């Protein structure tokens, strides 16, 4: 079963990227399966709502009283060794905030990391019936 461990926020990076100090470490997290439009992005730079998908991301991680990382069943971290997990702030995970708000796609997920997938699935559904940012 999945659980969720402390961390405390350094810096919130990008729409899906946050750096957190966890187990005494600075470290850079990756947010399990989801894509944001990216503003750091390698061959784009900024899309139409990555400036808004990183300022939800920032707000979010940096009004919070305690940051839970929780990490899935399969490896940690990605080849850019960020560590790949579900964020909570206060209790509320911010890969479904994002999805939901439809600042965020599900991404494609590979096995054994997806066990979250069909609960994200969920809220990108209705974030595309509301017709929110993304799928306005």
């Known amino acids: 079963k999945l659980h969720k461990e402390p961390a405390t926020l350094?810096?919130?990076?990008?729409?899906?990227?946050?750096?957190?100090?966890?187990?005494?470490?600075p470290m850079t997290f990756r947010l399990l399966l989801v894509d944001?439009?990216?503003?750091?992005?390698?061959?784009?730079?900024?899309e139409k709502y990555g400036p808004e998908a990183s300022a939800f991301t920032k707000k979010m991680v940096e009004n919070?009283?305690?940051?839970?990382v929780e990490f899935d069943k399969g490896q940690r971290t990605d080849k850019y060794?960020?560590?790949?997990?579900?964020?909570?702030?206060d209790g509320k995970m911010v890969n479904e905030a994002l999805?939901?708000?439809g600042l965020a796609k599900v991404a494609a997920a590979a096995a054994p990391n997806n066990t979250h997938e069909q609960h994200l699935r969920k809220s990108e559904a209705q974030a595309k019936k509301e017709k929110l940012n993304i799928w306005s």
């Open 10 to 25: 350094i810096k919130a990076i990008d729409g899906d990227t946050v750096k957190l100090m966890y187990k005494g470490q």
């Open 36 to 46: 944001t439009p990216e503003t750091k992005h390698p061959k784009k730079g900024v």
């Open 64 to 68: 919070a009283k305690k940051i839970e």
């Open 81 to 89: 060794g960020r560590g790949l997990a579900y964020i909570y702030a």
């Open 99 to 101: 999805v939901r708000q």
